[PDB]
Ligand binder design. Structure first.
Ligand SMILES: COc1ccc(-n2nc(-c3cn(CCOc4cc5c(cc4Oc4ccc(C(=O)O)c(F)c4)[C@@](C)(CC(=O)Nc4nccs4)NCC5)nn3)cc(C)c2=O)cc1
Lengths: 210, 213, 481, 92
């Protein structure tokens, strides 16, 4: 079977800057390769068909090239709406279709540090019998970060969950919210709690003791 | 115009089966190939099967060999999908896509979400996240609800700047937990009253909670 | 990028007829350009049924991986789902072409025959009748690692027989088999690991190997030649294929020893294009066999002129050769000696219009030896031949006990000269080649020599096979402009 | 004076089907008459023969499906140049 290998997995660029995405076929596919654009909450959209032809109603900044095994997709000037997920597609015998892994085009801006905030379990939640410690990491860049929960200088055993917002519409930043969920009995027989943040510049633990 | 109207999304019990439809309009239904392609959140495109509305000829992905079945009704210009013995990994957004034979996928469905869970409908418990320099942030925790989604607004929608409502997380109980935070100047903490407006539409649960240190 | 088999293809109303299996005309590589005729004649009777012809249609006119990108093709079904056919069913397909030639308007017709059976008298006769009607027939040599003269339509003198070469320009090997060879083969072409249209899906590609892929490659070149010059005759087209081919790139060690001299060392190419120049080619006769009065006869193709005649024997027991007029053309006749294994007659076939070559013979003189020259106005000496009746012994010279023969061609536009090279104690062969821009017309060995097996031309090099200095004598001609 | 031809590669021979090739100047009416004369002489001897095709444009003659026993009889027919036994061709 044919395998479509896309490179890179993530492309971080600035608007106006040029973008090049590569799709490599494991076999000869001629010029019968397609490109798709997928915006979040949407279905993919045909971008380039037959490796070089622009689909109807797509701007001229999108251009495709290649024949055989190596294929490229070029965006001359990055418009802010061009930051999406890109897929290369080809037909095959068995299976009848092959999709690439996808390439996420990301907005690049200056390195921003997270405005790290900590939140203790609310007293109304303490009556319910389960504690939840929340660590906020507001408006940072890039999306790569790490949170290590420190209950009285011990580690994060795996009783924590986190979620990251999508890149902001205004400042192109990211935000994270980690939740250390502990039982009421384990929350009582401990004193100090902290969340250690790994981002650019220095380590920044933020603590709170009841 | 060409439209592909999907239907049959919702909740499926583990071991149960999803039953989806794809209503086609604006073209000669039998002259184009049709696929069912799914996509798990954050992951890529996974094809399920193919059908030729003319012949009835089908092709299936080997992973869903015994579990998947694709049929059609040319009189209704409708495509059908059935996927038996579902597991939590089968939770994805399912699409129906038109195949222009030998060229590309020219038309797609809107995307239908199917969630595999044995949990029952439950309203959330809303807990505040009290604040404590120049700018301070505060929020409220929306915990233990099923199914997703929940909508959070601040001060009945008058507070939009600096708001970050986070995606929910599926926890061990099978329930969802979410948090929404706003960043405000520390000076207006005493003057301005901050409330989060939680709405869990599947259970008609509307909760307003005040944030105070 | 561009597949290896298309490296020697320079891109600058012609119909290509295909007699093969069923084809998938809907394939993106060939759709809209390849027509499916209503012809079908197969013995002993889905995606596997189409596999062979689809690939070959893609090899000829494929949009991405074809030789003649966008060439008009018309397919006939003579091979079943297992790629098997009959000679009878093949004749009916050929008659269908002859009927289609008369209905449809005039234009160059290329008939691609990527099939082979044993030698067939009726099939070769059918190929002759079509070639007499102006059809260019391109055939596969066969994948039996055998002499292609034993296979039809490969053995038909009027067709272009194509052998197969790999990416390293070496003859294709497939287990105990591989490409055919011999004097019936015109040239070789890429025939291993050839990417082309797969009948599995409308945009699928598959790699296939064989003389069928090599013959389809040559049909592609021929269609491109006929698109640019639709008035090229078959003789002109055969000469151009030979002239455009890569030379001496095949290691002949792959071929059996007795087939190395017979097999042309040519791999098809289409170099960048560019007045009148002299084009010559070498033809080998059939082996004469053991008889003191046995005779090997080499003749040229219609529209060609015979300019020289040479002979060869692996044992050396021979009585030379002679040129004689049969019809309105000269023929190369080689003579065997008593107790000889047999001889080969070697002719030099050139495109020299209205040359009216005549043979001029001087009888043995038994004096100090024999001599003859071209004395006519606007005549040039193109070849020197010599034969003798004895069992043991601008001018042509021979032994005093032998007759001398001169080929005198009326060609005012040519200027000819003689190049010699002699070796006292030769190590099996003596070589002399024409300079750049010169065309070899005649290859002979100088008489009075110890023991010569024979002489033959290999492109523009005179090769004299050895057991006084043994001298290789080359007659080189070229146009004055 | 008529000759017989067959495949030298014995596994590729297809006896029972023959191509009766006539002399070059033979008219189509003479080809159809020869095929009728062949069918008549074979039926008088208890043999069933089938004329599969009659060649017009390319070469004079016809395609016959008959027993090999009739070859001596068919070679004695007038206007006949040669008869060739059908054989197999293969994709290369
Ligand atoms: C009426 O019943 C007949 C009875 C006998 C004859 N013949 N037949 C032959 C004869 C037949 N073969 C087997 C096929 O021998 C070749 C096949 C191919 C090729 C070259 C071949 O080599 C020959 C062919 C013809 C003659 C030639 O003398 O006509 C020759 F000297 C050498 C080439 C390389 C193409 C080629 O160059 N094409 C030619 N076309 C005419 C002259 S070269 N490729 C396709 C395939 N070898 N010799 C010789 C004589 C003297 C003769 O009277 C004809 C009809």
């Amino acid at each position: 079977e044919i395998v479509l290998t896309q490179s890179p997995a993530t492309l971080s660029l600035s608007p106006g800057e040029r973008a090049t995405i590569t799709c490599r076929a494991s076999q000869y596919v001629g010029s019968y390769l397609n490109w798709y654009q997928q915006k979040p909450g949407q279905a993919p959209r045909l971008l380039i068909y037959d490796a070089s032809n622009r689909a109807t109603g797509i701007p001229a900044r999108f251009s495709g090239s290649g024949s055989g095994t190596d294929f490229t997709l070029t965006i001359s000037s990055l418009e802010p709406e061009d930051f999406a997920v890109y897929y290369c597609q080809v037909w095959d015998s068995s299976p009848p279709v092959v999709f690439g892994g996808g390439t996420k085009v990301e907005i690049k801006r200056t390195v921003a540090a997270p405005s790290v905030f900590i939140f203790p379990p609310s007293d109304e939640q303490l009556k319910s019998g389960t504690a939840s410690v929340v660590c906020l990491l507001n408006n940072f860049y890039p999306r790569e970060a790490k949170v290590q929960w420190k209950v009285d200088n011990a580690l994060q055993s795996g009783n924590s969950q986190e979620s990251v917002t999508e890149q902001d519409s205004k400042d192109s930043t990211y935000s994270l919210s980690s939740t250390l969920t502990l039982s009421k009995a384990d929350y009582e027989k401990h004193k100090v709690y902290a969340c250690e943040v790994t981002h650019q510049g220095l380590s920044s633990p933020v603590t709170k003791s009841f | 115009e060409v439209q592909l109207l999907e239907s049959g999304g919702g909740l499926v019990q583990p071991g149960g089966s999803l039953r989806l439809s794809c209503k086609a309009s604006g073209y000669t239904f039998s002259s184009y190939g049709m696929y069912w392609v799914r996509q798990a959140p954050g992951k890529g495109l996974e094809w399920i099967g193919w059908i030729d509305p003319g012949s009835g000829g089908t092709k299936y992905n080997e992973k869903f060999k015994g579990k998947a079945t694709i049929s059609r009704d040319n009189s209704k210009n409708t495509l059908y999908l059935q996927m038996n013995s579902l597991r939590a990994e089968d939770t994805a957004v399912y699409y129906c896509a038109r195949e222009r034979y030998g060229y590309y996928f020219d038309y797609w469905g809107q995307g239908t979400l199917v969630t595999v869970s044995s949990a029952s409908t439950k309203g959330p418990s809303v807990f505040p996240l009290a604040p404590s320099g120049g700018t301070a942030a505060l929020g409220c925790l929306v915990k233990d609800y099923f199914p997703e989604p929940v909508t959070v607004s601040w001060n009945s929608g008058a507070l939009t700047s600096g708001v970050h409502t986070f995606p929910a997380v599926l926890q061990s109980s099978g329930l969802y937990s979410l948090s929404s935070v706003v960043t405000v100047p520390s000076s207006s903490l005493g003057t301005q009253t901050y409330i989060c407006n939680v709405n869990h539409k599947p259970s008609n649960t509307k909760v307003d909670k005040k944030v105070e240190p | 990028s561009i597949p290896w088999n298309l490296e020697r293809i320079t891109p600058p109303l012609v119909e290509v007829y295909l007699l093969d299996t069923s084809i998938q005309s809907d394939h993106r590589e060939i759709e809209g350009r390849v027509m499916v005729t209503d012809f079908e004649n197969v013995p002993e009777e889905a995606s596997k049924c189409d596999s062979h012809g689809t690939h070959l249609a893609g090899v000829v006119s494929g949009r991405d991986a074809g030789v003649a990108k966008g060439a008009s093709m018309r397919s006939l079904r003579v091979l079943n789902c297992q790629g098997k056919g009959t000679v009878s069913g093949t004749l009916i397909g050929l008659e269908f072409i002859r009927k289609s030639q008369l209905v449809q308007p005039v234009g160059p017709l290329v008939v691609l025959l990527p099939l082979a059976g044993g030698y067939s008298r009726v099939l070769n006769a059918a190929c002759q009748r079509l070639a007499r009607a102006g059809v260019v027939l391109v055939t596969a040599a066969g994948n039996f690692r055998d002499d292609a003269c034993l296979y039809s339509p490969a053995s038909a003198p009027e067709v272009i027989t194509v052998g197969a070469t790999n990416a390293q320009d070496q003859p294709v090997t497939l287990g105990t088999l591989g490409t055919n060879f011999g004097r019936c083969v015109d040239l070789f072409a890429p025939g291993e690991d050839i990417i082309g249209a797969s009948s599995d899906c409308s945009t699928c590609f598959v790699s296939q190997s064989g003389t069928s892929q090599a013959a389809a490659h040559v049909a592609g070149i021929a269609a491109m030649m006929l698109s640019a010059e639709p008035e090229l005759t078959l003789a002109e087209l055969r000469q151009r294929l030979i002239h455009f081919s890569a030379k001496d790139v095949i290691n002949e060690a792959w071929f059996p020893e007795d087939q190395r001299v017979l097999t042309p060392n040519l791999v098809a190419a289409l170099p960048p294009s560019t007045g009148w120049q002299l084009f010559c080619r070498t033809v080998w006769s059939a082996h004469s066999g053991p008889t003191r009065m046995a005779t090997a006869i080499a003749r040229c193709a219609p529209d060609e002129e015979l300019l020289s005649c040479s002979s060869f024997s692996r044992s050396g027991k021979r009585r030379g050769e002679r040129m004689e007029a049969q019809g309105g053309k000269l023929v190369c006749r080689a003579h065997n000696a008593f107790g000889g294994e047999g001889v080969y007659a070697i002719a030099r076939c050139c495109l020299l219009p209205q040359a009216n070559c005549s043979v001029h013979t001087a009888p043995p003189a038994e004096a100090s030896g024999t001599r003859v020259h071209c004395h006519q106005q606007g005549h040039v000496l193109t070849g020197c031949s010599s034969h003798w009746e004895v069992e043991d012994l601008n001018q042509c010279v021979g032994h005093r006990e032998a007759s001398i023969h001169a080929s005198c061609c009326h060609a005012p536009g040519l200027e000819c000269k003689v190049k010699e090279h002699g070796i006292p104690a030769p190590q099996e062969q003596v070589t002399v080649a024409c300079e750049e821009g010169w065309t070899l017309t005649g290859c002979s060995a100088l008489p009075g020599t110890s023991h010569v097996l024979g002489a033959y031309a290999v492109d523009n090099t005179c090769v004299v096979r050895s057991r006084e200095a043994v001298t290789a004598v080359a007659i080189c001609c070229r146009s004055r402009h």
